Amino acid sequence: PTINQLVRKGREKVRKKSKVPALKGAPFRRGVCTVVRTVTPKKPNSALRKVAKVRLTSGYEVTAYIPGEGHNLQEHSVVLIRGGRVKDLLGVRYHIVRGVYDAAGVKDRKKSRSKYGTKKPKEA
Amino acid sequence: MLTDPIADMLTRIRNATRVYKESTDVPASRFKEEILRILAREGFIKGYERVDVDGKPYLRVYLKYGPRRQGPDPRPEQVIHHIRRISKPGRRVYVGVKEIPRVRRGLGIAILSTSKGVLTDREARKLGVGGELICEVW
Amino acid sequence: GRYIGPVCRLCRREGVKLYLKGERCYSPKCAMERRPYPPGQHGQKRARRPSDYAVRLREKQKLRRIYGISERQFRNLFEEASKKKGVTGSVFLGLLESRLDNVVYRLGFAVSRRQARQLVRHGHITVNGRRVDLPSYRVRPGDEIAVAEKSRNLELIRQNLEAMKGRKVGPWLSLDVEGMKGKFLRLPDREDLALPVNEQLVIEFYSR
Amino acid sequence: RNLSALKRHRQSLKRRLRNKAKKSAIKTLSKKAIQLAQEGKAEEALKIMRKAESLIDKAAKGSTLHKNAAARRKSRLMRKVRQLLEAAGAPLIGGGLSA
Amino acid sequence: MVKIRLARFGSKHNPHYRIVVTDARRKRDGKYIEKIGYYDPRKTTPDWLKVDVERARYWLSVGAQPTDTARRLLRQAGVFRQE
Amino acid sequence: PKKVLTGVVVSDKMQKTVTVLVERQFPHPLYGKVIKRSKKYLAHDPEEKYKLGDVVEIIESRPISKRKRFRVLRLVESGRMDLVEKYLIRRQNYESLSK
RNA sequence: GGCUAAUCCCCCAUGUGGACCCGCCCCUUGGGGUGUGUCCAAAGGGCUUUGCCCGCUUCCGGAUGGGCCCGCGUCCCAUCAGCUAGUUGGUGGGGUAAUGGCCCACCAAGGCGACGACGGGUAGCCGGUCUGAGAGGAUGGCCGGCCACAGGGGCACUGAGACACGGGCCCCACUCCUACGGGAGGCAGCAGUUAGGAAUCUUCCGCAAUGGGCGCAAGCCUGACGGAGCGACGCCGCUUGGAGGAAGAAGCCCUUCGGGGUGUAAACUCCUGAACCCGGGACGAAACCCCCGACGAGGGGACUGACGGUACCGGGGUAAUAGCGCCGGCCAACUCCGUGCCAGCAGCCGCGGUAAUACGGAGGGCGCGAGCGUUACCCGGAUUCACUGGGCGUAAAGGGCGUGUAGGCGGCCUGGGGCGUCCCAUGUGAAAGACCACGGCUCAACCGUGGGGGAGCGUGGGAUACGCUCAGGCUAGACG
Ligand SMILES: [Mg+2]
Ligand SMILES: [Mg+2]
Ligand SMILES: [Mg+2]
Ligand SMILES: [Mg+2]
Ligand SMILES: [Mg+2]
Ligand SMILES: [Mg+2]
Ligand SMILES: [Mg+2]
Ligand SMILES: [Mg+2]
Ligand SMILES: [Mg+2]
Ligand SMILES: [Mg+2]
Ligand SMILES: [Mg+2]
Ligand SMILES: [Mg+2]
Ligand SMILES: [Mg+2]
Ligand SMILES: [Mg+2]
Ligand SMILES: [Mg+2]
Ligand SMILES: [Mg+2]
Ligand SMILES: [Mg+2]
Ligand SMILES: [Mg+2]
Ligand SMILES: [Mg+2]
Ligand SMILES: [Mg+2]
Ligand SMILES: [Mg+2]
Ligand SMILES: [Mg+2]
Ligand SMILES: [Mg+2]
Ligand SMILES: [Mg+2]
Ligand SMILES: [Mg+2]
Ligand SMILES: [Mg+2]
Ligand SMILES: [Mg+2]
Ligand SMILES: [Mg+2]
Ligand SMILES: [Mg+2]
Ligand SMILES: [Mg+2]
Ligand SMILES: [Mg+2]
Ligand SMILES: [Mg+2]
Ligand SMILES: [Mg+2]
Ligand SMILES: [Mg+2]
Ligand SMILES: [Mg+2]
Ligand SMILES: [Mg+2]
Ligand SMILES: [Mg+2]
Ligand SMILES: [Mg+2]
Ligand SMILES: [Mg+2]
Ligand SMILES: [Mg+2]
Ligand SMILES: [Mg+2]
Ligand SMILES: [Mg+2]
Ligand SMILES: [Mg+2]
Ligand SMILES: [Mg+2]
Ligand SMILES: [Mg+2]
Ligand SMILES: [Mg+2]
Ligand SMILES: [Mg+2]
Ligand SMILES: [Mg+2]
Ligand SMILES: [Mg+2]
Ligand SMILES: [Mg+2]
Ligand SMILES: [Mg+2]
Ligand SMILES: [Mg+2]
Ligand SMILES: [Mg+2]
Ligand SMILES: [Mg+2]
Ligand SMILES: [Mg+2]
Ligand SMILES: [Mg+2]
Ligand SMILES: [Mg+2]
Ligand SMILES: [Mg+2]
Ligand SMILES: [Mg+2]
Ligand SMILES: [Mg+2]
Ligand SMILES: [Mg+2]
Ligand SMILES: [Mg+2]
Ligand SMILES: [Mg+2]
Ligand SMILES: [Mg+2]
Ligand SMILES: [Mg+2]
Ligand SMILES: [Mg+2]
Ligand SMILES: [Mg+2]
Ligand SMILES: [Mg+2]
Ligand SMILES: [Mg+2]
Ligand SMILES: [Mg+2]
Ligand SMILES: [Mg+2]
Ligand SMILES: [Mg+2]
Ligand SMILES: [Mg+2]
Ligand SMILES: [Mg+2]
Ligand SMILES: [Mg+2]
Ligand SMILES: [Mg+2]
Ligand SMILES: [Mg+2]
Ligand SMILES: [Mg+2]
Ligand SMILES: [Mg+2]
Ligand SMILES: [Mg+2]
Ligand SMILES: [Mg+2]
Ligand SMILES: [Mg+2]
Ligand SMILES: [Mg+2]
Ligand SMILES: [Mg+2]
Ligand SMILES: [Mg+2]
Ligand SMILES: [Mg+2]
Ligand SMILES: [Mg+2]
Ligand SMILES: [Mg+2]
Ligand SMILES: [Mg+2]
Ligand SMILES: [Mg+2]
Ligand SMILES: [Mg+2]
Ligand SMILES: [Mg+2]
Ligand SMILES: [Mg+2]
Ligand SMILES: [Mg+2]
Ligand SMILES: [Mg+2]
Ligand SMILES: [Mg+2]
Ligand SMILES: [Mg+2]
Ligand SMILES: [Mg+2]
Ligand SMILES: [Mg+2]
Ligand SMILES: [Mg+2]
Ligand SMILES: [Mg+2]
Ligand SMILES: [Mg+2]
Ligand SMILES: [Mg+2]
Ligand SMILES: [Mg+2]
Ligand SMILES: [Mg+2]
Ligand SMILES: [Mg+2]
Ligand SMILES: [Mg+2]
Ligand SMILES: [Mg+2]
Ligand SMILES: [Mg+2]
Ligand SMILES: [Mg+2]
Ligand SMILES: [Mg+2]
Ligand SMILES: [Mg+2]
Ligand SMILES: [Mg+2]
Ligand SMILES: [Mg+2]
Ligand SMILES: [Mg+2]
Ligand SMILES: [Mg+2]
Ligand SMILES: [Mg+2]
Ligand SMILES: [Mg+2]
Ligand SMILES: [Mg+2]
Ligand SMILES: [Mg+2]
Ligand SMILES: [Mg+2]
Ligand SMILES: [Mg+2]
Ligand SMILES: [Mg+2]
Ligand SMILES: [Mg+2]
Ligand SMILES: [Mg+2]
Ligand SMILES: [Mg+2]
Ligand SMILES: [Mg+2]
Ligand SMILES: [Zn+2]
């Protein structure tokens, strides 16, 4: 565009939409489970995934993925939402954090325990 | 009406040299004549002279080239590899004396118009004046 | 704290001899003898062509692991060098070499860099008459580096020093073996060091 | 509790009254002169005017007024008096004003 | 009342004073009219006090009031000397 | 320095006041073109000395009214009615651009 | 309702002087001088009381601090296009320290808007900070400057100063006291509780230092402040050892069953000596005061710690925490076993449906290391809003065509101006930060001293090529 046109009008800065309304700007949010279900993955894969509907402290209600192997989560257990999505599941934007509140860290897991919230095994 | 006669001179020259013409006529004005004087002094052209064409005054710019070449494409190197406008009507540009550009690490020129007259970049720094930044040439 | 563990392993991973072990990295014990190949089970297997990244990385790893310095300190020192007027690579090397424990290694109070670090740490080293217990101290040219009077009778100190007899020291230094003194006269240049490292590779490493 | 800056408030009250009164008097006086000026009574309006002026300056003496406030009020009075004074003016007293 | 006193410019356990002219009304470490000196109590340097007397004399000419410490330093540096 | 501006008088319609159109030009802060904006100043004309289409100097002054901070210094040039015509017409164009 | 003191209030006096109306002079917005007229002051206290000290009064000036006004700059939505009644100006008036529709009366009919008025949305602003090669983008925590607010809304009194956080009146909500009439409150001060939340500290020590208030002082106040406490929240420094030690123990790992790995790693040999115990032990602090001298200068000269018996010095002294992510590509690091579209991984591409270097452990490896990963957010990359620095025949993109308004843009020659433009000088650009240098804590982080830098704006001077402008020519454009 001509310069005169840039004075008259000028470039437009580009707004971006937040992939996570955990609202609040918050890095995590505490919520209570509602449904603890299994879910069918999107077309390219096959499995049984463990997700949970959650009512947040933000007055928001969303499904959240349960990572790790085993999970003790039940209907009324209270949990901490992480954020980050699961590419192959429709409509799940956030993750559960294991080891926090009622979410139990993955039992027996020896490899990367920072994620999955398990503590260090003792060896003698 | 030429909307920017200076740009038109620069271009006339560009197109000319690109088809390897020996000379070109550009419609004349003292300001163009000043620019040319700088090119000539600076080694870019063989120099220029005033002519009349159907009674109307022009300037023959005589063009300078490298020697003939080896292999495919014997066409000689250009002496003006690059010539471009900086200040144009509709966006005008002025450098202070500390904003004067070092053009192609100095193997090039920038022609400024100043209140001391039309000078090269070195010329202006040495003179110590800023001005309207016209051409960039290398 | 720094890397504490088998060193001659790192001799082995860089495929070159960087002696942090002092003696025996001299005698045919260094394991770089007859086992030049890197550690682990895949070390004796073939070698895949290194990415540009890999090259730069490893070269930096050589330069750091030689001086036995924390990557934190290392990079902070690097940026410090890059800021300084003058050629980044040489400047860097000068600052690395300017480290107190390093100077102590150079002056020959310790057979190894790490041992010298210890010497500094435990107060066995003085600068301009005054004790300095921190190995990260920077020696400005003209400083004197001495084995502090109290420990001058120490077994290991005299042990090394008596071996240092007749040996030549670095040209940017001076050493008085009967006095345990020494003087850091100038900063060492590129050429002053025999360092088996191309510094430009390191500069390029921190470029990204 | 019971901060004794309480006392300050108490004094503020006393002062308040003492000001209002003083200031009030002035108004009442000024008007007097002014009205007496409309009726073109030379002597009387003048003497009231003198009293008003004096009392203004005396308000200025303390925190009631002073500043330029007194000079402002005084000016306005005197102007309005002298100005009002022309209908067959003949300001016989002439005491208060430069002749 | 325009004043002359010390503001604290050092660090924790490391006091460094900047002798300034400022309205007493203003806070200690905030904007000052002029910096006439510095003071080091731990005396870590061969120069732990400096003054620029002629200036201090000006500020006294127009009525600044030194705090007793400030005055002490000023006199030490001899703003007040006469004969 | 009290600020002096030069403009043309586009409105006489008030009492003892004129509207003065004052242009200024300057480089655009990003795009660098020289752009020319303008603004109306209300200037105090006590004697009704100045008329429509007069290019006058305007000086920063003690506030006359709300919106009048300036008075007319002198007459730079008389009778530029083309400037006026420009303003009048730009404002006439407003009757479009709406509903 | 009664008594009474004062540096509390009031009345004459003196008028240095000042205020005010009117005149005159200069000056030029209400600055200064002057003459007459009217009007205005004060407070006493302490000493050694024949002299000094603390005060009081009118005035001029200084200094510092603020009030008000103007130029310019300061986010998004035009699916917000018209807004405006004290609204725009005037005369007179009220109010104030002071200009002003700041307020009131009367008069005129104006004022603003595509150069974005009005409307809506978000928001304290700045010095700066993060990022970026830069231009730019983003942000404004702590520290400094300014503003605004003190449960919500209005209001004034007192005062040099407030429309006043720990002052007052009223209305509303809330909590508490209540003899049911009526009252009391206001942590966005330091700590602390409670709720909300992913989450944010001690109901500590001290007025020794700096600073502030009152006081002649002695001194009193000071949750400002100076410290200590808790939290790897951030930065910096430091330890978990050093040297010797097998052609290489056992265990675990792979195996072509020849052996390869973990690895000088361990054991063990020798040496230093974190913690810790013992002893000495601070600077920060010399004023205020005292004495000489004249309560000056000068000279001397004694008291005064929270931190804390802490920092540090000296002596003695033990081998004495390692974790976390990752290892298909991007990307540095590979192998067995287990599991078989499962269980699971996953930032994108994509792995897993019997040989899985991508799932799960193990051995080994890489990376960092008192940390390491994750999530959220910002800049980066992204030249993907392109000023630097992009495009539109078929990829997204030429308006269906014209006429022409605002606007943007403008041939050749001469001259005046000097608005843009450029140069010089000067003012400003606080401090802190940033950059440079030197220095102070053993180093650094941190701090001090000094130097340099700087866009922008003010003022003075100068240049005239280009842009502008004014005037005068020209004919190559345009029209005839
Ligand atoms: Mg000319
Ligand atoms: Mg010629
Ligand atoms: Mg450009
Ligand atoms: Mg460098
Ligand atoms: Mg250089
Ligand atoms: Mg040398
Ligand atoms: Mg970089
Ligand atoms: Mg009292
Ligand atoms: Mg009455
Ligand atoms: Mg009297
Ligand atoms: Mg007035
Ligand atoms: Mg103040
Ligand atoms: Mg100074
Ligand atoms: Mg003096
Ligand atoms: Mg008129
Ligand atoms: Mg008015
Ligand atoms: Mg209209
Ligand atoms: Mg009574
Ligand atoms: Mg009574
Ligand atoms: Mg009585
Ligand atoms: Mg009295
Ligand atoms: Mg009297
Ligand atoms: Mg007199
Ligand atoms: Mg007069
Ligand atoms: Mg008189
Ligand atoms: Mg009396
Ligand atoms: Mg005064
Ligand atoms: Mg002011
Ligand atoms: Mg904003
Ligand atoms: Mg809509
Ligand atoms: Mg109204
Ligand atoms: Mg009205
Ligand atoms: Mg009228
Ligand atoms: Mg008025
Ligand atoms: Mg007031
Ligand atoms: Mg405008
Ligand atoms: Mg903001
Ligand atoms: Mg807000
Ligand atoms: Mg920056
Ligand atoms: Mg930067
Ligand atoms: Mg920037
Ligand atoms: Mg900004
Ligand atoms: Mg901002
Ligand atoms: Mg703020
Ligand atoms: Mg602040
Ligand atoms: Mg301000
Ligand atoms: Mg409010
Ligand atoms: Mg509250
Ligand atoms: Mg409320
Ligand atoms: Mg309120
Ligand atoms: Mg007062
Ligand atoms: Mg008052
Ligand atoms: Mg209040
Ligand atoms: Mg308020
Ligand atoms: Mg309170
Ligand atoms: Mg009450
Ligand atoms: Mg809680
Ligand atoms: Mg809670
Ligand atoms: Mg704290
Ligand atoms: Mg206490
Ligand atoms: Mg104190
Ligand atoms: Mg004090
Ligand atoms: Mg006092
Ligand atoms: Mg006494
Ligand atoms: Mg108290
Ligand atoms: Mg504190
Ligand atoms: Mg923790
Ligand atoms: Mg943590
Ligand atoms: Mg060893
Ligand atoms: Mg073995
Ligand atoms: Mg074996
Ligand atoms: Mg021992
Ligand atoms: Mg002390
Ligand atoms: Mg001392
Ligand atoms: Mg003393
Ligand atoms: Mg005496
Ligand atoms: Mg003395
Ligand atoms: Mg003395
Ligand atoms: Mg004391
Ligand atoms: Mg103690
Ligand atoms: Mg010791
Ligand atoms: Mg010892
Ligand atoms: Mg051990
Ligand atoms: Mg790779
Ligand atoms: Mg994984
Ligand atoms: Mg199997
Ligand atoms: Mg298999
Ligand atoms: Mg397969
Ligand atoms: Mg695997
Ligand atoms: Mg992977
Ligand atoms: Mg794996
Ligand atoms: Mg491992
Ligand atoms: Mg650290
Ligand atoms: Mg972290
Ligand atoms: Mg980005
Ligand atoms: Mg960009
Ligand atoms: Mg870029
Ligand atoms: Mg994008
Ligand atoms: Mg562009
Ligand atoms: Mg630009
Ligand atoms: Mg494109
Ligand atoms: Mg198509
Ligand atoms: Mg298309
Ligand atoms: Mg078309
Ligand atoms: Mg189309
Ligand atoms: Mg036009
Ligand atoms: Mg032209
Ligand atoms: Mg000019
Ligand atoms: Mg001239
Ligand atoms: Mg300047
Ligand atoms: Mg600065
Ligand atoms: Mg600082
Ligand atoms: Mg600093
Ligand atoms: Mg330094
Ligand atoms: Mg130092
Ligand atoms: Mg500094
Ligand atoms: Mg500095
Ligand atoms: Mg400077
Ligand atoms: Mg100028
Ligand atoms: Mg000028
Ligand atoms: Mg000229
Ligand atoms: Mg000209
Ligand atoms: Mg021209
Ligand atoms: Mg034009
Ligand atoms: Mg003409
Ligand atoms: Mg003709
Ligand atoms: Mg024709
Ligand atoms: Zn080795």
From Swiss-Prot, chain B:
GO (cellular component) term, any one: ribosome
Single GO MF annotation: structural constituent of ribosome
Highest taxon of the lineage: Bacteria
Transmembrane parts of this sequence: none
SUPFAM superfamilies xrefs: Ribosomal protein S8
PROSITE patterns: RIBOSOMAL_S8
GO biological process: translation
Keywords: Ribonucleoprotein, Ribosomal protein, RNA-binding, rRNA-binding
Pfam families with a match to the protein in the record: Ribosomal_S8 (PF00410)
Disulfide bonds: none
Family of this protein: Belongs to the universal ribosomal protein uS8 family.
Role noted for this protein: One of the primary rRNA binding proteins, it binds directly to 16S rRNA where it helps nucleate assembly of the platform of the 30S subunit central domain. The combined cluster of proteins S8, S12 and S17 appears to hold together the shoulder and platform of the 30S subunit.
Quaternary context: Part of the 30S ribosomal subunit. Contacts proteins S2, S5 and S12.
Record-given protein name: Small ribosomal subunit protein uS8
Native source organism of the sequence: Thermus thermophilus (strain ATCC 27634 / DSM 579 / HB8)
Source taxonomy: Bacteria, Thermotogati, Deinococcota, Deinococci, Thermales
Curated annotation (Swiss-Prot), chain C:
Gene3D superfamilies to which the protein is assigned, alphabetical: Ribosomal Protein S4 Delta 41, Chain A, domain 1, RNA-binding S4 domain
Keyword hit for Metal-binding: yes
Required cofactor names: Zn(2+); [4Fe-4S] cluster
Binding-site residues for Zn(2+), renumbered to this chain: C8, C11, C25, C30
SUPFAM superfamilies registered for this protein in UniProt: Alpha-L RNA-binding motif
Pfam families associated with the record: Ribosomal_S4, S4
Record's protein name: Small ribosomal subunit protein uS4
Organism for this UniProt entry: Thermus thermophilus (strain ATCC 27634 / DSM 579 / HB8)
Phylogenetic placement of the source organism: Bacteria, Thermotogati, Deinococcota, Deinococci, Thermales
UniProtKB/Swiss-Prot annotation, chain D:
Stretches the record annotates as Disordered: 1-25
Signal peptide positions (record): none
GO terms assigned for molecular function: small ribosomal subunit rRNA binding; structural constituent of ribosome
GO BP terms in the entry: translation
Subunit structure: Part of the 30S ribosomal subunit.
Entry protein name: Small ribosomal subunit protein bS20
Family, per entry: Belongs to the bacterial ribosomal protein bS20 family.
InterPro entries reported for this sequence: Ribosomal_bS20, Ribosomal_bS20_sf
UniProt lineage: Bacteria, Thermotogati, Deinococcota, Deinococci, Thermales
Family annotation (Pfam families): Ribosomal_S20p
Function: One of the primary rRNA binding proteins, it binds directly to 16S rRNA where it nucleates assembly of the bottom of the body of the 30S subunit, by binding to several RNA helices of the 16S rRNA.
Coiled-coil zones: none
Annotated Gene Ontology cellular component terms: small ribosomal subunit
Organism: Thermus thermophilus (strain ATCC 27634 / DSM 579 / HB8)
Gene name, Swiss-Prot/TrEMBL: rpsT
HAMAP family: Ribosomal_bS20
UniProtKB keywords: Ribonucleoprotein, Ribosomal protein, RNA-binding, rRNA-binding
UniProtKB/Swiss-Prot annotation, chain E:
UniProt KW keywords: Ribonucleoprotein, Ribosomal protein
An example Gene Ontology biological process: translation
Pfam families reported for this sequence: Ribosomal_S16 (PF00886)
GO molecular function, one term: structural constituent of ribosome
GO cellular component: cytoplasm; small ribosomal subunit
Domain of life: Bacteria
Keyword Ribonucleoprotein: yes
InterPro entries: Ribosomal_bS16, Ribosomal_bS16_dom_sf
Keyword match Ribosomal protein: yes
Function field: Binds to the lower part of the body of the 30S subunit, where it stabilizes two of its domains.
Assembly: Part of the 30S ribosomal subunit.
Family assignment from sequence similarity: Belongs to the bacterial ribosomal protein bS16 family.
Name by which UniProt lists this protein: Small ribosomal subunit protein bS16
